[PDB]
Coordinates of C-alpha atoms and ligand atoms in Angstrom, one line a residue:
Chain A
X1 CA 5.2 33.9 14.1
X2 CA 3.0 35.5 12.3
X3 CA 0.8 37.6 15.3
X4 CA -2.0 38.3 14.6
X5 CA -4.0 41.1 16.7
X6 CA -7.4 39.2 18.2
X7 CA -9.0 43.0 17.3
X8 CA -8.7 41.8 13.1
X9 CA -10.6 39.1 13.9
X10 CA -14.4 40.6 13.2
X11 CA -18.1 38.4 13.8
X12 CA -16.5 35.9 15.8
X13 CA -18.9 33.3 15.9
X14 CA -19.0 29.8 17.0
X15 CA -17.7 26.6 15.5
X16 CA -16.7 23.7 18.0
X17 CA -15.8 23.3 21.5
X18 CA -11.8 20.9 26.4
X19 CA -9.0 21.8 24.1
X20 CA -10.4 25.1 23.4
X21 CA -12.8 26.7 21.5
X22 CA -13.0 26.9 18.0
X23 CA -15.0 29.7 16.6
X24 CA -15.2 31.3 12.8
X25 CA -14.0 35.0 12.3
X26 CA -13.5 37.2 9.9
X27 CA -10.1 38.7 8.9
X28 CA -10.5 42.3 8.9
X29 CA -7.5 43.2 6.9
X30 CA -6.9 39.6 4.5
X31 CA -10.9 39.5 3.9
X32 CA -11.0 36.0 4.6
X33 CA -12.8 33.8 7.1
X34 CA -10.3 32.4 9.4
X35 CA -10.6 30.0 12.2
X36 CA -9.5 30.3 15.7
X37 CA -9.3 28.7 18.7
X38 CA -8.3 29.7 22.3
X39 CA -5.8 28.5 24.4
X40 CA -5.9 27.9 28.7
X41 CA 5.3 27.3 25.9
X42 CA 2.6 26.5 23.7
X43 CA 4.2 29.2 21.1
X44 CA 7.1 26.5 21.0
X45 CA 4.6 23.7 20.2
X46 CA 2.9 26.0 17.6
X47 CA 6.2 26.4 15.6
X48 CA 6.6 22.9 15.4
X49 CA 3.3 22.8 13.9
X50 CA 4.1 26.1 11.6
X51 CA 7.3 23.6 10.1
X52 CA 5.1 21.0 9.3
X53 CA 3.8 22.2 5.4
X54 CA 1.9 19.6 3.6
X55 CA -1.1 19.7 1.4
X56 CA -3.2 17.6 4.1
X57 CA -2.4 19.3 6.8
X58 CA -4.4 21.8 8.3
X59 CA -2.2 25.6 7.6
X60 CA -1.7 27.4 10.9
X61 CA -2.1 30.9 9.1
X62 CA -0.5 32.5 13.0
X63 CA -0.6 33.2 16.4
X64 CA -2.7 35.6 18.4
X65 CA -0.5 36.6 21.2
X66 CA -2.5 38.8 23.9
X67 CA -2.2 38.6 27.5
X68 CA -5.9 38.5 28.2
X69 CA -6.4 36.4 24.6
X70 CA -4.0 33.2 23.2
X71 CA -5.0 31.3 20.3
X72 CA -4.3 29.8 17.5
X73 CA -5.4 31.1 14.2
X74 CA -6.1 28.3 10.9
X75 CA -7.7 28.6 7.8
X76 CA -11.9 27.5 7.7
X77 CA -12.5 24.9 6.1
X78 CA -15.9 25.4 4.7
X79 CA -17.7 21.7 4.5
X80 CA -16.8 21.3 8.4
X81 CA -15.3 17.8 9.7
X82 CA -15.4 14.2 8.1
X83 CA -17.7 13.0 10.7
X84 CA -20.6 15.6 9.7
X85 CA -20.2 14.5 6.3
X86 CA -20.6 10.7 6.8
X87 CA -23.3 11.0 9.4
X88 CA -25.6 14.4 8.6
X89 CA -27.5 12.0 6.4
X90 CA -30.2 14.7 6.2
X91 CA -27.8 17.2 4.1
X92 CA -25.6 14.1 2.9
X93 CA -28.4 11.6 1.8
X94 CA -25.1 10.5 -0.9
X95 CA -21.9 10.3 -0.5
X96 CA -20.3 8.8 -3.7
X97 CA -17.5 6.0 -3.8
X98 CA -14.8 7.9 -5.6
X99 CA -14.5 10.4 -2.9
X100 CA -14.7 8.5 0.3
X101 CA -11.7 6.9 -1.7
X102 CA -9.6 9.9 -2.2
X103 CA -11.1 11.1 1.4
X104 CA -8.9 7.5 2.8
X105 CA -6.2 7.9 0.0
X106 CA -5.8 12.1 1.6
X107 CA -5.8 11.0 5.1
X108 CA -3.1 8.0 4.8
X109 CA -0.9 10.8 2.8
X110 CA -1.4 13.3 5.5
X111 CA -0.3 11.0 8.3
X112 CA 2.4 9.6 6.7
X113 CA 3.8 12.9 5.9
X114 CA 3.4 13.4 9.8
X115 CA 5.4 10.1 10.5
X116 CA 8.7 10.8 8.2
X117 CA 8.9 14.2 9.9
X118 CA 12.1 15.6 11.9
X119 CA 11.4 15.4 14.8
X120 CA 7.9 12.8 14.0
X121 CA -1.0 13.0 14.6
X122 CA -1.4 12.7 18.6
X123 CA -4.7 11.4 18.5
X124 CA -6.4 10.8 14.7
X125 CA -10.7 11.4 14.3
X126 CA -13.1 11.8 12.5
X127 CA -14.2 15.1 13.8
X128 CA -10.0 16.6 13.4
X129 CA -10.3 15.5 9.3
X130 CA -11.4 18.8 8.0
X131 CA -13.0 19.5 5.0
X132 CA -11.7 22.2 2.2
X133 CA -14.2 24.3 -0.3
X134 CA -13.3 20.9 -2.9
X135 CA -13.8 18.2 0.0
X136 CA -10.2 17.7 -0.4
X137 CA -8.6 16.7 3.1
X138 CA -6.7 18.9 5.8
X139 CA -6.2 16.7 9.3
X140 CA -6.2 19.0 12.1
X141 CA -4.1 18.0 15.0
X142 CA -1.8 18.8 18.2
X143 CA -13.9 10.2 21.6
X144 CA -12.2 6.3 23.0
X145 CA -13.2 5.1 19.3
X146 CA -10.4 5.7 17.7
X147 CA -7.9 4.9 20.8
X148 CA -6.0 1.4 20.5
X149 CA -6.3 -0.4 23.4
X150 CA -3.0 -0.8 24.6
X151 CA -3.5 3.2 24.9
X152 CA -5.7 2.8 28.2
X153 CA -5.1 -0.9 28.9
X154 CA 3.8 4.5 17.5
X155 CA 1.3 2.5 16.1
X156 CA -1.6 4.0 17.1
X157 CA -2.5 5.9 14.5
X158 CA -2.7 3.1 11.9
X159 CA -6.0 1.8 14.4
X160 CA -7.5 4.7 14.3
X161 CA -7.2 5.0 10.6
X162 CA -8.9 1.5 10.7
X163 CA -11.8 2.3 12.3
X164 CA -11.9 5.9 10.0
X165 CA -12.0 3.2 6.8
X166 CA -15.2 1.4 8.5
X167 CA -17.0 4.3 9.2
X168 CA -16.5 5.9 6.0
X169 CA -17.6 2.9 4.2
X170 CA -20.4 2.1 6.6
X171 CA -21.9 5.6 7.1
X172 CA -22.4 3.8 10.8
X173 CA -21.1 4.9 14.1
X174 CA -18.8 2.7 15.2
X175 CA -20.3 1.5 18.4
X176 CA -23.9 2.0 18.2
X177 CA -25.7 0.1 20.6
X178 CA -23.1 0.8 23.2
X179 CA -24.0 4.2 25.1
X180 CA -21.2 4.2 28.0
X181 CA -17.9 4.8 26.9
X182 CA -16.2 2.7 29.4
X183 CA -17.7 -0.6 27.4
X184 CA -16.6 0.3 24.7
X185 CA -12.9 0.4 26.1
X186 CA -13.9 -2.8 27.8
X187 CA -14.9 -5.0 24.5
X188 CA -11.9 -3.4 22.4
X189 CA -9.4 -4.4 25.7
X190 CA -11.5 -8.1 24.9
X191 CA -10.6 -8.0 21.4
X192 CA -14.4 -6.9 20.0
X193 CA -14.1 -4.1 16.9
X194 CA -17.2 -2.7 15.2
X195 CA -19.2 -5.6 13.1
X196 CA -18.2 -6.4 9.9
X197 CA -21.4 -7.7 7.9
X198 CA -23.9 -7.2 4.9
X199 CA -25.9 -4.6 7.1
X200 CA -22.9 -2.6 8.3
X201 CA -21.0 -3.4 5.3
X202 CA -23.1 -4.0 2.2
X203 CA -22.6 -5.8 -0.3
X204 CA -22.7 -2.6 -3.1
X205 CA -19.3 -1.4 -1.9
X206 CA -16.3 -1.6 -4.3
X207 CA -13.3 -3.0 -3.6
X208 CA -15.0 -5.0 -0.1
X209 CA -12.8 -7.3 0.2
X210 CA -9.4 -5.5 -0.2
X211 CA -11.0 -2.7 2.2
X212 CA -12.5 -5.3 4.8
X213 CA -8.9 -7.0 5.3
X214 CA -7.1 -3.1 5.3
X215 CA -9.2 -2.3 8.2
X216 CA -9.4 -6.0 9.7
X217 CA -5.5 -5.7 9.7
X218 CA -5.4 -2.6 10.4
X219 CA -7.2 -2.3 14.1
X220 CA -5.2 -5.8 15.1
X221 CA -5.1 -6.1 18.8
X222 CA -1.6 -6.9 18.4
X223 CA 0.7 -3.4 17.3
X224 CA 2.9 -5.3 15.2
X225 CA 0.4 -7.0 12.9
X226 CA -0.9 -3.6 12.0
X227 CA 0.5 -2.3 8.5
X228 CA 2.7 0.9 7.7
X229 CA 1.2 4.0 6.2
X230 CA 3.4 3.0 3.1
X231 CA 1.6 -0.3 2.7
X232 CA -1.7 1.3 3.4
X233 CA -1.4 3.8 0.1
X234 CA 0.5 0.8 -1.6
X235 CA -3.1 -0.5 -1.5
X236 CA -5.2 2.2 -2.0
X237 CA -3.3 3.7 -5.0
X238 CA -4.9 0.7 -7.3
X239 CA -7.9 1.3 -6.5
X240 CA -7.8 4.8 -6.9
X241 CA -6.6 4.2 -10.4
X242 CA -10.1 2.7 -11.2
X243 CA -12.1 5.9 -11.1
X244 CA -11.4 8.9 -13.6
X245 CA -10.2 12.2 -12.6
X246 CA -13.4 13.7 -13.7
X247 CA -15.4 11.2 -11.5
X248 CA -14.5 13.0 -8.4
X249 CA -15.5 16.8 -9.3
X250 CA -18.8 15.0 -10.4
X251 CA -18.8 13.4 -6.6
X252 CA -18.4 16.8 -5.5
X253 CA -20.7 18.4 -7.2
X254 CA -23.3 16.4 -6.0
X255 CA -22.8 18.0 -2.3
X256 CA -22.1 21.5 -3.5
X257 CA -24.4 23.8 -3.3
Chain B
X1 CA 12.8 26.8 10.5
X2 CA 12.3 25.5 6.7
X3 CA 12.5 21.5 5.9
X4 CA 15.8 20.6 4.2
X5 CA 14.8 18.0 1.6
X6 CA 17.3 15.6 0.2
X7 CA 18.0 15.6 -3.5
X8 CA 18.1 12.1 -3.8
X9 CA 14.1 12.1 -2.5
X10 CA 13.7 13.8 -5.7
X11 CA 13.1 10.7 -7.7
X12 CA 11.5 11.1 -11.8
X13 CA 13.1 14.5 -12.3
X14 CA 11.0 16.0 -15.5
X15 CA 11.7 19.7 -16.8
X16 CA 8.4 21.8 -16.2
X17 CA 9.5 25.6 -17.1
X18 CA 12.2 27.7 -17.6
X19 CA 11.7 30.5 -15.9
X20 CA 13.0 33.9 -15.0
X21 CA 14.3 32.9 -11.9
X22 CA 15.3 29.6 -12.4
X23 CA 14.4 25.9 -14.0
X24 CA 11.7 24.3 -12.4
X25 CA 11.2 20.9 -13.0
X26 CA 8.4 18.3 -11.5
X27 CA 9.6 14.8 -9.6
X28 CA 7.8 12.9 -7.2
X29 CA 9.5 12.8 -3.6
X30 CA 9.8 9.4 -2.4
X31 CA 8.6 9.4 1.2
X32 CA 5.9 11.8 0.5
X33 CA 4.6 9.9 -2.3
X34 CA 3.2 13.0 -4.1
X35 CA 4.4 15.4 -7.0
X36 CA 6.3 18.2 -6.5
X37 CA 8.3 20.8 -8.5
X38 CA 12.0 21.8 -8.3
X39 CA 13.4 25.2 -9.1
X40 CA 17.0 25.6 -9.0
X41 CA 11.1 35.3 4.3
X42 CA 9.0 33.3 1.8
X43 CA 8.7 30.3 4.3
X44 CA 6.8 33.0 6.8
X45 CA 4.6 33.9 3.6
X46 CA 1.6 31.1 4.5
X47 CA -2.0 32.1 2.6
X48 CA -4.6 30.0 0.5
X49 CA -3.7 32.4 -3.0
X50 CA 0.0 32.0 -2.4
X51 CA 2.1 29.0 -3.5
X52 CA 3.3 26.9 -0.8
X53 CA 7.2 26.2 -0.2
X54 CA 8.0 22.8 1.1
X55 CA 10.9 23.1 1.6
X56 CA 14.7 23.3 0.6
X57 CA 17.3 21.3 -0.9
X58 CA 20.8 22.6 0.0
X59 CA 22.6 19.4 -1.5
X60 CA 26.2 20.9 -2.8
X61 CA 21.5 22.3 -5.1
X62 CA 20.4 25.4 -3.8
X63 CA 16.9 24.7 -4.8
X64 CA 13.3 25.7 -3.4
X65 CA 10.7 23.0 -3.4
X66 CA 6.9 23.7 -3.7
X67 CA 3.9 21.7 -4.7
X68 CA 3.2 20.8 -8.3
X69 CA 0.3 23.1 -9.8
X70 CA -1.2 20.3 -11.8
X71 CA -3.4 23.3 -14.3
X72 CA 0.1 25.2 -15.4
X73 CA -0.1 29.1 -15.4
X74 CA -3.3 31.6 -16.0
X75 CA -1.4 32.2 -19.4
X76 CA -1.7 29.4 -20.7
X77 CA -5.8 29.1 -19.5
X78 CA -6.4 32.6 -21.3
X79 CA -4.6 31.9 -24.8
X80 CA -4.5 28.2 -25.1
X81 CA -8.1 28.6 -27.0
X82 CA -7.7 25.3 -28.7
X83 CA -7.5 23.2 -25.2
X84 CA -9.4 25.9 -23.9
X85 CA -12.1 27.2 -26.0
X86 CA -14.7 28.3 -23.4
X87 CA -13.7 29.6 -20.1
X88 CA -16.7 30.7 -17.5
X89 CA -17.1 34.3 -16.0
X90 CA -17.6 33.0 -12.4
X91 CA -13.9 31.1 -12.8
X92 CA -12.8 33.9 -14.5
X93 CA -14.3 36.3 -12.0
X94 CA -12.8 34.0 -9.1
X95 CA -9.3 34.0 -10.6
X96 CA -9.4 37.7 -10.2
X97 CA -10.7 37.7 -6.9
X98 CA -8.2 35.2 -5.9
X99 CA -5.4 37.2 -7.4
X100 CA -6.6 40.6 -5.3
X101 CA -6.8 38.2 -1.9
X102 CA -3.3 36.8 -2.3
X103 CA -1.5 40.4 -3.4
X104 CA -3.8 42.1 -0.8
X105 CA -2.1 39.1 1.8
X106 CA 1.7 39.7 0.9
X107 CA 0.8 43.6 1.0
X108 CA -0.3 43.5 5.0
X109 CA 2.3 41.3 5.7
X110 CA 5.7 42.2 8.3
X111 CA 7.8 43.2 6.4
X112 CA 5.4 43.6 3.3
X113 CA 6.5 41.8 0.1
X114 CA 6.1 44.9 -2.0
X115 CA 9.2 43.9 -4.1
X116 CA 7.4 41.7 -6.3
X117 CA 6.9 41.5 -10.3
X118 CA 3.3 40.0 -11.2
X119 CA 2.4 38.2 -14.6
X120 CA 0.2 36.0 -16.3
X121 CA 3.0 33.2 -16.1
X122 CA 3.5 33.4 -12.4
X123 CA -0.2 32.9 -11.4
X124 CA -0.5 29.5 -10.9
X125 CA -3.8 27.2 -11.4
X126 CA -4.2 24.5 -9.0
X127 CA -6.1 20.8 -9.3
X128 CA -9.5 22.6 -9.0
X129 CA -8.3 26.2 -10.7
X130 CA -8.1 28.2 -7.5
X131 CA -5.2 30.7 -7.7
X132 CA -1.4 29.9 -6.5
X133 CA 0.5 33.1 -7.1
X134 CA 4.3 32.0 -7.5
X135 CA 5.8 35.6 -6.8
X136 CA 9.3 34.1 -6.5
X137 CA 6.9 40.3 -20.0
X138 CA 7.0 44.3 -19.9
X139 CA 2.9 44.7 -20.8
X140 CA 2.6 44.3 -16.3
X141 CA 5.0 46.8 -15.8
X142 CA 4.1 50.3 -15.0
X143 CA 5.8 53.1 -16.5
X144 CA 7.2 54.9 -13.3
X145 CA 9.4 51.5 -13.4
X146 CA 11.2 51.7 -16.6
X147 CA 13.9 53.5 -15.2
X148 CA 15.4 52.2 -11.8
X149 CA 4.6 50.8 -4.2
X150 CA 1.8 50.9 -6.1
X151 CA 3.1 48.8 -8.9
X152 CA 1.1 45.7 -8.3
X153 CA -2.1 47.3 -9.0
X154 CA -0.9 48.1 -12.5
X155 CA -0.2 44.5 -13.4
X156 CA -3.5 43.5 -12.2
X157 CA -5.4 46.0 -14.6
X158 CA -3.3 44.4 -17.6
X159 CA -3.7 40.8 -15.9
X160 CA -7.7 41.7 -15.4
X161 CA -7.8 43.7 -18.7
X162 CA -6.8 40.0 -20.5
X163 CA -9.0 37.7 -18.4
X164 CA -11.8 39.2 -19.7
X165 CA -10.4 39.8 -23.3
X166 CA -8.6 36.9 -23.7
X167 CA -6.5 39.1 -26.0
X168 CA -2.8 39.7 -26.0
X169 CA -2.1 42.9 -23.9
X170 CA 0.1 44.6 -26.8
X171 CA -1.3 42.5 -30.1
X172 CA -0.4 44.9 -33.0
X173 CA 2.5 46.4 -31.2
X174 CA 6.1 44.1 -32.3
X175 CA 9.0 45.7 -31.0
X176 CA 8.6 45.5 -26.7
X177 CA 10.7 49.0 -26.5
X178 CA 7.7 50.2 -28.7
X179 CA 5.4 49.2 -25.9
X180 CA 6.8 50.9 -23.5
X181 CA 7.3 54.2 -25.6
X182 CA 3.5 54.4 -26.0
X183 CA 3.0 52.9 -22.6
X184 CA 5.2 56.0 -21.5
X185 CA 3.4 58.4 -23.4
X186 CA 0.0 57.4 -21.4
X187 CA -1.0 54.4 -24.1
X188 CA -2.9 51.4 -22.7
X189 CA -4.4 48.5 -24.2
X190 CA -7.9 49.1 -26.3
X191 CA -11.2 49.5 -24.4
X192 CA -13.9 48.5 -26.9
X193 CA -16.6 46.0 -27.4
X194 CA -14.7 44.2 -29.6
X195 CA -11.6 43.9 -26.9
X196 CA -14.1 43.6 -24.3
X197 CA -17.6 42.7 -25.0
X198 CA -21.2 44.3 -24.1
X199 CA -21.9 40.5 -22.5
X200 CA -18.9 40.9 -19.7
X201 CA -20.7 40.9 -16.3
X202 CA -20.2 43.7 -14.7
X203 CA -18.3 45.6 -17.3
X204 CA -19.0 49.3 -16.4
X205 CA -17.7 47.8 -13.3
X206 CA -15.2 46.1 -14.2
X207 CA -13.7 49.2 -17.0
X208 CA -13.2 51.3 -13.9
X209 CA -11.2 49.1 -12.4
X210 CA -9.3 48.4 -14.9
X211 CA -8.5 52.0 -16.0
X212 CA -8.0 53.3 -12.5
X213 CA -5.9 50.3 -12.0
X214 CA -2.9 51.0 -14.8
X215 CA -3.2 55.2 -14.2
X216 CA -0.1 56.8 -15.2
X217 CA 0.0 58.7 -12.0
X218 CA 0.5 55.8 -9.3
X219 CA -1.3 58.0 -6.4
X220 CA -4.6 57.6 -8.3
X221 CA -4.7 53.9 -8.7
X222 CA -6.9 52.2 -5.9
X223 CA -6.0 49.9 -3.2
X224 CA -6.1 45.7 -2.8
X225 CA -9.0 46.6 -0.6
X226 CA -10.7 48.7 -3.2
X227 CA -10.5 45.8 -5.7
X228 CA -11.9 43.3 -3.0
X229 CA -14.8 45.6 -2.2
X230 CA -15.6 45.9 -5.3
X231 CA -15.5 42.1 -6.8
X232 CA -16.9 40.6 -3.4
X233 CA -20.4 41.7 -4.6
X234 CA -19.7 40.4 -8.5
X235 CA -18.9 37.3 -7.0
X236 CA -21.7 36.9 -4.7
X237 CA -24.0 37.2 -8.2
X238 CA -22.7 33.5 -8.7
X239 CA -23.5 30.0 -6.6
X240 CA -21.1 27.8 -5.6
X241 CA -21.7 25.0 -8.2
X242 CA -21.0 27.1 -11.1
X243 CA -17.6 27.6 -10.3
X244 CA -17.4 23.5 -10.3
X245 CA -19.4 23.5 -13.2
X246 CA -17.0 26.0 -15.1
X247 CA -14.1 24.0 -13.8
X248 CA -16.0 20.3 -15.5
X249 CA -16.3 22.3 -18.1
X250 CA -12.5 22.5 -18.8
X251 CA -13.2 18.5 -19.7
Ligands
9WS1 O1 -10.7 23.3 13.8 C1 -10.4 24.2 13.0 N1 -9.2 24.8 13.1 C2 -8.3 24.6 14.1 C3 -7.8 23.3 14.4 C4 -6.9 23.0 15.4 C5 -6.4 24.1 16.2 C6 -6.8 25.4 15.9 C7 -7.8 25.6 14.9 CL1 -8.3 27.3 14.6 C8 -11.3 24.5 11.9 C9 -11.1 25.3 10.7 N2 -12.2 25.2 10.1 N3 -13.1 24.5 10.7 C10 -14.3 24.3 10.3 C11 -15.2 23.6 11.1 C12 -14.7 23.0 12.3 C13 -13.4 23.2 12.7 C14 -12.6 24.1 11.8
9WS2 O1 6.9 27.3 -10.3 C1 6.6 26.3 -9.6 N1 7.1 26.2 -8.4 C2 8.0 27.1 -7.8 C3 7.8 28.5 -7.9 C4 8.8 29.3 -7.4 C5 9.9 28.8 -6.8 C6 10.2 27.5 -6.8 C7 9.2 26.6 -7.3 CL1 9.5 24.9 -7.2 C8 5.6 25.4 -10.2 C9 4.8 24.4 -9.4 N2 4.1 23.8 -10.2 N3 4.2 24.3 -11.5 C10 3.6 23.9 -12.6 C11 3.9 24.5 -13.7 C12 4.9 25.6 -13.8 C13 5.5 26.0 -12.6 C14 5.1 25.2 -11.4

C-alpha cells in the first residue's frame, strides 16, 4: 500500500545483508534510486510502519508484493549508516562537533517520536541510523552492543542511545579489545560499559562533562535511573544553541564531495 | 490510517500564509518537540519532492498538519532579490529537476493526482533548498483551461521560464484577463537575451524545453520523463559540493 512491481526496480545491486538483504535499485518509472530489501502478515507490520511519518524516520516509499519476490521498498540514503561515518576514518579523517551534535540531537527526536506513538525502535544501532544527501538523520527500524542487559540476562532504547553518544564522541568501537561477543554480554551483565577516559574521551570535546554524565546515566544498570527521551533533548537543546546554523552546512561540506 | 493530532499539541500558534486553500500557520507540537505548520489520498502520496502530511487535526478543526518548510516558497527565492541577490545555476538547475521528479511521482501514481494546479507559491524550499511541492496566479495556467492532462507541463515551462529569468512571467501586462487574451491568442512570455541570458547553462537546451513545454496544442508538449531525460545530463555537469556551496551562499 503502495505496490510496487520488483520489474521497476532496474541495476539492483548490493547494499547490506539475517533480516534480509538490502540492495540499491533504480526506479524505472520515478527515476530515483530506491532501496529494497527482501523478506523470508508482514504487510500488517509494514502498515504500521507506513503510519509512522516523521522527519527522522526512515520513509517506507511501498511494498513489493510478488509471490516468488516480498520486500520492502525505502528511500537511499546516500552517505550509508552512522557507523561507516564514525569509523571509515580513511574517507572520514574529520568529523566536526556541530554535526555529531545535531546527528545525537536527530536521533533522540526520532525515537521519541517513536515512543509517543499510538500504538508505541525494537532494537536502536549504529548501523539502522541512516544517513540523508545533507547527513541529516533517518533511523531505520522494525550486534549485543547496544542491548541492555536485563535484555539477555521499555527502557531499552535510552541504553542504546548511551552507548550511540560514546561512540560518536569517541570515534572508538565500543568494546575493542574484546573479540567474543559472549564477554561482552558477560562484563555489561557485571556492570562494565566502554571506558570513559582522556584516550577514549579526549579532552578537546565540547560540552565533556554534560555528555559524559548523559551517557553515564544513560546506560545505568538499573532501568529506572536511566532518563526519558524528553530529558535527553532537554539537555542537548543548550548545547545545540551554541553553534550557528551556518556551522553545520560548513560541517557538511567538509564530507561532501 | 492517518495520525489524528490534537489541537491543543499545537502550542505557539503563528500565522505563516494565507493561502488559496486555506490559512496556514506554524506552532510547535508539544510531544514532538519540532515545528510544524497548520492549514485549516494525499496521506498515500509518500516521495522525497512532495510535502509530507503528518497528520490531522479533527478537533470540532478540520486541519492538515505537515512539516514546517523553514526557506518559504520558490517565489519568494526568485523575486526577493534584496535577501536574495545571487542564486546559483546548479540550485537553480536542481530546483527544476526536483520539481520534474515530484510531478513525474504524483503522475505514475494509483489513482494519478492529475487534478493539480502548480505555482511558484506552492513549491516549497526546505532547510537545505531541496524541493517540497505543496500541491494541496493565472501566468501557470494553460489556455485549454480557461474555460471548464497535460496541464502540468505548462506550469513548469512558466515556472522554468522564471527560474532562469528571475523575471515576472507577465511584467508589462496589468490587467490578468489581458494575460490570458494574449495567452489565448498563442502569446507567451519573451524569449531574448535580455529575459534569458547568453551565460544560462544549457540554454539552447533549456529554450526547447521551455517552448515545447507551454505549446498551445497540449498533444505537443513532452512528458515528465522527457524533462528528466533531458536535465539528468545538465545536472550531472555539476559536483555535489556546489549545490552546498550555492545553498552557503544564500548566507
Ligand atoms: O536500509 C535501508 N533501507 C531499509 C531499511 C529497513 C528496511 C528496508 C529497507 Cl529498504 C537503506 C536505505 N538506504 N541505505 C543506504 C545504505 C544502507 C542501507 C540503506
Ligand atoms: O503550506 C504548508 N503546509 C501545508 C501545505 C498544504 C496543506 C497543509 C499544510 Cl500545513 C507550509 C509548511 N511550511 N510552510 C512554510 C511557508 C508557507 C507554507 C508552509
Amino acid at each position: 500500500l503502495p505496490t510496487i512491481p520488483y520489474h521497476k526496480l532496474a541495476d539492483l545491486r548490493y547494499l547490506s545483508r539475517a533480516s534480509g538483504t538490502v540492495s540499491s535499485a533504480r526506479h524505472a518509472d520515478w527515476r530515483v534510486q530506491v532501496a529494497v530489501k527482501h523478506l523470508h502478515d508482514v504487510l500488517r507490520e509494514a502498515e504500521i510502519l507506513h503510519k509512522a511519518r516523521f522527519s527522522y524516520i526512515l520513509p517506507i516509499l511501498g511494498i513489493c508484493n510478488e509471490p516468488e519476490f516480498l520486500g520492502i521498498v525505502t528511500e537511499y540514503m546516500p552517505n550509508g549508516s552512522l557507523n561507516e561515518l564514525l569509523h571509515r576514518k580513511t574517507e572520514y579523517p574529520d568529523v566536526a562537533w556541530p554535526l555529531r551534535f545535531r546527528i545525537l540531537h536527530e536521533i533522540a527526536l526520532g525515537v521519541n517520536y517513536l515512543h509517543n506513538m499510538t500504538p508505541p525502535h525494537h532494537d536502536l544501532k549504529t548501523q539502522n541510523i541512516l544517513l540523508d544527501n545533507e547527513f541529516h538523520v533517518k533511523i531505520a527500524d522494525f550486534t549485543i552492543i547496544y542491548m541492555p542487559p536485563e535484555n539477555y540476562e521499555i527502557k531499552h532504547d535510552i541504553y542504546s542511545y548511551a552507548v550511540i553518544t560514546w561512540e560518536v564522541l569517541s570515534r572508538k568501537q565500543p568494546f575493542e579489545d574484546v573479540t567474543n561477543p559472549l564477554q561482552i554480554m558477560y562484563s555489561v551483565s557485571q556492570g562494565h560499559r566502554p571506558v570513559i577516559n582522556e584516550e577514549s574521551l579526549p579532552y578537546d570535546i565540547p560540552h565533556r562533562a554534560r555528555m559524559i554524565s548523559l551517557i553515564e546515566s544513560g546506560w545505568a544498570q538499573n532501568p529506572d535511573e536511566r532518563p526519558s527521551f524528553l530529558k535527553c533533548l532537554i539537555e542537548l537543546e543548550p548545547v545545540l544553541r551554541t553553534f550557528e546554523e551556518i556551522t553545520f552546512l560548513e560541517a557538511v561540506i567538509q564530507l561532501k564531495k
